[PDB]
Amino acid sequence: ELNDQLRVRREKLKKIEELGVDPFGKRFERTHKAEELFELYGDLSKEELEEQQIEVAVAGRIMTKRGMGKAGFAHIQDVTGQIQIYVRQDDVGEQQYELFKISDLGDIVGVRGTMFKTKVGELSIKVSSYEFLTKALRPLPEKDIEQRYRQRYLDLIMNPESKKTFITRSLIIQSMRRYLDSHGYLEVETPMMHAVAGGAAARPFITHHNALDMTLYMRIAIELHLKRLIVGGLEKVYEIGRVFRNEGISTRHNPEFTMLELYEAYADFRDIMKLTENLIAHIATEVLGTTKIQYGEHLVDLTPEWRRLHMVDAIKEYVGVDFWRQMSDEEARELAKEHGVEVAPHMTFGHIVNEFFEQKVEDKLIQPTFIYGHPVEISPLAKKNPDDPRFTDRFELFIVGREHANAFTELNDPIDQRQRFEEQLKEREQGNDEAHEMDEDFLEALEYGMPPTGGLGIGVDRLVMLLTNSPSIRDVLLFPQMRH
Amino acid sequence: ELNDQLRVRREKLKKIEELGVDPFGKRFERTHKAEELFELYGDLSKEELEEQQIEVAVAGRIMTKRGMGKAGFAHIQDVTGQIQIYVRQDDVGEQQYELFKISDLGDIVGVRGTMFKTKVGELSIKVSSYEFLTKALRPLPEKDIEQRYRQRYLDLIMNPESKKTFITRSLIIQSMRRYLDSHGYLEVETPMMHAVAGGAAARPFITHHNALDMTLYMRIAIELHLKRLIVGGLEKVYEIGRVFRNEGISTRHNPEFTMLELYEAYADFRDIMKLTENLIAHIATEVLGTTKIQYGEHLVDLTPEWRRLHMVDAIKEYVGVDFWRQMSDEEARELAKEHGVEVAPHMTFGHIVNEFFEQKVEDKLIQPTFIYGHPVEISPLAKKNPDDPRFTDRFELFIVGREHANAFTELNDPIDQRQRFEEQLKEREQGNDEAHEMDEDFLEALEYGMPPTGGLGIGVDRLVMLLTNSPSIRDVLLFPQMRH
Numbered sequence: 026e027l028n029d030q031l032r033v034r035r036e037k038l039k040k041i042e043e044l045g046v047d048p049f050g051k052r053f054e055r056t057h058k059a060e061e062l063f064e065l066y067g068d069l070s071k072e073e074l075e076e077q078q079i080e081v082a083v084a085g086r087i088m089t090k091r092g093m094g095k096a097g098f099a100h101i102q103d104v105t106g107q108i109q110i111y112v113r114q115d116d117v118g119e120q121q122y123e124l125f126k127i128s129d130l131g132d133i134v135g136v137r138g139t140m141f142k143t144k145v146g147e148l149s150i151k152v153s154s155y156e157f158l159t160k161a162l163r164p165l166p167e168k169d170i171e172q173r174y175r176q177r178y179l180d181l182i183m184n185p186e187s188k189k190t191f192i193t194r195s196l197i198i199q200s201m202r203r204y205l206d207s208h209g210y211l212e213v214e215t216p217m218m219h220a221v222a223g224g225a226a227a228r229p230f231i232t233h234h235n236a237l238d239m240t241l242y243m244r245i246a247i248e249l250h251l252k253r254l255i256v257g258g259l260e261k262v263y264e265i266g267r268v269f270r271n272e273g274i275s276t277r278h279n280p281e282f283t284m285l286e287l288y289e290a291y292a293d294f295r296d297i298m299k300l301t302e303n304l305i306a307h308i309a310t311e312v313l314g315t316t317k318i319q320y321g322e323h324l325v326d327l328t329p330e331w332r333r334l335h336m337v338d339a340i341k342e343y344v345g346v347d348f349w350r351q352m353s354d355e356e357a358r359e360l361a362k363e364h365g366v367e368v369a370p371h372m373t374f375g376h377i378v379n380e381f382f383e384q385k386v387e388d389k390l391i392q393p394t395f396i397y398g399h400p401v402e403i404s405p406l407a408k409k410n411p412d413d414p415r416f417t418d419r420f421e422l423f424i425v426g427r428e429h430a431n432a433f434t435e436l437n438d439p440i441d442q443r444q445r446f447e448e449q450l451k452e453r454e455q456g457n458d459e460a461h462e463m464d465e466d467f468l469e470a471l472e473y474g475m476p477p478t479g480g481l482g483i484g485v486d487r488l489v490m491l492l493t494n495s496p497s498i499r500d501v502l503l504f505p506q507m508r509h
Numbered sequence: 510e511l512n513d514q515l516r517v518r519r520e521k522l523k524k525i526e527e528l529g530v531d532p533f534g535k536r537f538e539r540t541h542k543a544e545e546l547f548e549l550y551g552d553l554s555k556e557e558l559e560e561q562q563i564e565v566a567v568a569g570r571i572m573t574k575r576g577m578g579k580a581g582f583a584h585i586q587d588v589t590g591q592i593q594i595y596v597r598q599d600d601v602g603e604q605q606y607e608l609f610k611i612s613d614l615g616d617i618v619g620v621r622g623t624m625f626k627t628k629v630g631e632l633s634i635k636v637s638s639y640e641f642l643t644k645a646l647r648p649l650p651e652k653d654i655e656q657r658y659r660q661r662y663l664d665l666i667m668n669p670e671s672k673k674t675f676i677t678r679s680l681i682i683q684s685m686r687r688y689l690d691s692h693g694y695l696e697v698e699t700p701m702m703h704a705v706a707g708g709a710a711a712r713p714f715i716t717h718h719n720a721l722d723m724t725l726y727m728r729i730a731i732e733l734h735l736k737r738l739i740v741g742g743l744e745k746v747y748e749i750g751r752v753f754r755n756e757g758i759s760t761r762h763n764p765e766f767t768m769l770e771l772y773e774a775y776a777d778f779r780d781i782m783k784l785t786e787n788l789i790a791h792i793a794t795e796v797l798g799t800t801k802i803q804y805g806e807h808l809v810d811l812t813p814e815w816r817r818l819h820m821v822d823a824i825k826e827y828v829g830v831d832f833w834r835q836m837s838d839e840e841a842r843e844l845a846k847e848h849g850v851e852v853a854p855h856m857t858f859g860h861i862v863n864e865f866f867e868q869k870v871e872d873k874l875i876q877p878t879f880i881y882g883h884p885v886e887i888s889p890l891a892k893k894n895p896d897d898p899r900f901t902d903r904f905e906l907f908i909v910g911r912e913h914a915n916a917f918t919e920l921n922d923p924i925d926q927r928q929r930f931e932e933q934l935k936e937r938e939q940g941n942d943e944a945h946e947m948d949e950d951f952l953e954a955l956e957y958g959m960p961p962t963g964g965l966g967i968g969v970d971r972l973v974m975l976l977t978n979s980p981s982i983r984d985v986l987l988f989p990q991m992r993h
């Protein structure tokens with residue numbers, strides 16, 4: 026249907042060339058961007074602009090073009106929006122007017138001219154110089170949820186709002202580092218290719234190094250090397266880097282995502298809760314100018330202090346079941362069968378409690394909530410709670426029914442840590458193939474002495490979704506993993 | 510080595526618990542860093558301190574200890590330095606003093622006490638409260654790049670100069686993003702898992718996605734996806750991220766390294782030259798306080814503007830062979846034989862010229878130098894020079910004999926880009942297993958139109974090696990890839 030349409034364009038290219046101009050342009054000096062023009066000359070009168078001859082120079086893509094004859098208009102779009110340009114043969118000459126006439130929607134051009142207003146009052150640029158910058162061999166679509174991610178470049182051109190989202194994303198990450206850097210946290214870079222994939226319960230992407238003939242695993246967490254830094258005496262460190270998990274895609278999951286991992290010597294999980302809430306309220310204030318944001322049909326208030334609720338209590342409140350009493354694994358399995366909570370063959374009281382939470386409770390936590398007291402069985406890298414060792418001084422931040430962060434009072438006792446790992450291995454022989462793996466090197470590190478520490482993990486992408494009211498993670502990732 | 514010392518520390522742990530103490534501590538609130546205490550109170554005499562009775566709280570690892578019966582001293586080290594603590598049973602009580610007595614070198618403790626100077630004059634802290642915070646089961650290093658790289662934590666604790674290097678690295682990167690952002694370049698995040706390993710000439714790490722059953726390649730460059738963003742109308746983008754290349758290690762290369770990639774629509778490689786020198790000059794100025802630096806035996810002057818030299822003129826200056834001469838591939842092969850320049854079967858004029866440069870010229874370029882005009886055969890993503898099509902508008906930045914950047918006037922003409930890819934595939938046929946691979950998606954992207962663009966790539970690790978006078982990249986990477 027539109028196969029020679031591409032040939033129509035492939036022809037104007039030949040014509041443009043033989044017309045003596047580089048169809049793919051040279052450098053172009055600009056003076057402003059569309060948005061600056063309106064903010065600087067949007068309120069000036071038509072005749073005072075005509076008098077002032079304010080010369081500008083801009084560049085962009087042709088989104089709309091109209092008017093035949095010896096004069097025409099077109100809307101040029103740059104990163105900040107669109108601005109109308111007006112080209113008259115009796116102004117730019119014949120060669121340039123010809124360049125304007127052959128120009129296609131989608132083609133990129135640069136112009137020099139003066140500000141002025143049409144009778145209808147639109148602010149525009151009276152072109153006195155029309156430069157051809159780039160020929161588009163394929164036309165613009167016209168003005169598909171999944172076709173937007175498959176060709177993000179087309180999306181960014183056609184939907185202004187998407188652009189805003191990604192800009193907002195850059196501001197969020199930038200705001201995060203300014204806060205952390207100013208509070209003494211050292212931004213560092215640790216390995217992404219590991220001998221042993223530790224720091225979480227997750228399946229890894231496996232690769233191989235040819236020269237060193239080594240099997241390397243892409244990191245499923247940043248935790249283990251950062252901890253080595255704490256043993257290293259660095260005290261405060263953070264890292265915002267990519268993490269990789271051989272998992273299937275979700276509305277809130279992507280194989281490679283961005284996580285913030287930070288550790289603070291001499292702090293515990295309650296300290297981290299405060300850090301977490303201040304950090305996020307800060308970012309919201311700095312970037313959006315407020316702590317009250319919309320997400321779905323919810324108005325989420327990020328103003329500290331946020332609710333602290335123990336996982337076991339959350340379960341009593343939303344389910345009506347108690348896990349505070351001493352309980353046998355058998356009794357936990359009964360309560361599970363009764364409430365329709367699924368359990369794995371390797372699960373025990375601890376795992377079951379968490380299943381009760383994740384399956385019957387979490388989705389209902391809308392306002393920022395610090396869920397704490399995660400059972401020790403599912404927290405192999407966290408310190409046991411003193412008063413009741415069945416649970417740990419760990420917490421997960423929940424907002425709009427999903428986890429935005431994971432943190433704990435770190436386990437620096439190396440003997441206990443080794444014991445957690447063996448238990449993890451036992452769980453594996455029992456069906457759990459996400460059980461953590463023994464890392465002697467890491468354990469060796471703890472053996473030189475890691476001070477008491479508080480660690481924090483934050484899903485940056487998810488935070489971005491929250492602050493941009495994005496229903497899917499693929500709306501906040503420039504090139505989400507495609508099924509292909 | 511410490512067969513029993515281990516038994517002794519191990520058994521010591523048990524004794525701390527009997528004292529009723531958590532051998533791995535709780536959180537501890539500090540008031541200052543050791544260094545701040547010297548900067549604030551070092552000038553005050555012994556009695557001035559006695560009058561002002563300055564209460565403080567510090568924490569650190571025990572570096573030295575002296576036990577004089579019922580009172581002793583110890584030097585504890587925090588991230589900023591050491592401070593001496595004076596612990597007398599008369600003040601802290603018998604219980605706490607037994608904790609002090611049993612404390613081993615390497616153990617971490619925190620104290621609260623007042624500032625004061627001993628008869629000798631060393632600023633100290635007369636402790637009123639001694640808190641055991643962590644037991645080191647192994648004794649710190651007794652003293653080879655081995656443990657420094659394999660056990661970086663020990664290095665960071667025992668060698669302050671290594672610690673500063675990593676602190677300076679955080680500053681260099683922080684400084685870089687400062688310039689870029691304030692100059693309008695948008696920081697973004699693009700995929701590290703690619704369907705096609707393109708954007709560079711390198712052998713990648715291959716991996717597999719289970720759920721989607723798909724072969725993925727770890728990025729060998731960030732280029733392609735960033736250019737899709739320029740097509741997207743983002744105009745000015747940058748990404749400081751990890752890049753992976755399945756190549757052997759050396760003092761100049763690590764399999765996973767940090768590269769800065771940035772693109773600017775409407776600019777060309779000359780514009781990029783100016784940016785590169787301003788950026789680097791900015792970082793050095795802001796971090797070292799000067800652009801005049803020392804690297805090894807060299808006194809390198811980073812003050813712009815830097816020397817501009819065409820690769821061909823460089824070969825003429827440093828070797829004597831003039832490649833401006835139109836010659837056949839065979840004559841170039843003959844010239845290669847006569848000057849001891851090794852070539853490969855797939856090579857023609859263009860490749861040979863570059864080998865003359867890398868083999869015979871590179872190492873002689875000490876002062877910052879912009880080498881430009883790379884032959885087209887090795888520049889598949891760079892636009893060809895208008896005057897002499899054998900070369901492209903591209904440059905590499907050489908300093909102290911090594912490459913620190915690669916950049917060019919981007920090839921935005923899709924017909925020509927396709928042609929280059931075909932040439933590369935052809936080379937791979939002839940044995941060049943580092944030839945760029947085809948990426949239809951990228952070609953489709955350029956087909957929608959990409960403005961003339963200026964692209965740049967800087968090896969961040971190498972820039973930091975330069976600014977910290979680190980002879981090896983393994984000195985600016987917290988945990989470098991080690992040999993099996």
Ligand SMILES: NCCCC[C@H](N)C(=O)NOP(=O)(O)OC[C@H]1O[C@@H](n2cnc3c(N)ncnc32)[C@H](O)[C@@H]1O
Binds near residue numbers: 279284429432
């Ligand atoms: N030492 C304290 C804990 C630090 C973090 C820990 N090392 C870790 O690996 N945690 O993993 P998670 O708790 O599963 O991840 C933390 C956050 O990252 C986000 N996240 C996790 N997995 C994905 C994913 N696959 N895709 C996108 N986002 C993800 C989410 O917000 C989650 O709460």
Ligand SMILES: NCCCC[C@H](N)C(=O)NOP(=O)(O)OC[C@H]1O[C@@H](n2cnc3c(N)ncnc32)[C@H](O)[C@@H]1O
Binds near residue numbers: 732767964965
């Ligand atoms: N579009 C303009 C060019 C952008 C960069 C281009 N896409 C690219 O891939 N370049 O690759 P190189 O030029 O080989 O690398 C750029 C810089 O990275 C550094 N580098 C390259 N490989 C390693 C390495 N293996 N280890 C440490 N640093 C490295 C070095 O400074 C080098 O000059």
Ligand SMILES: [Mg+2]
Binds near residue numbers: 421428429430431
């Ligand atoms: Mg979580």
Ligand SMILES: [Mg+2]
Binds near residue numbers: 905912913914915
């Ligand atoms: Mg290079």
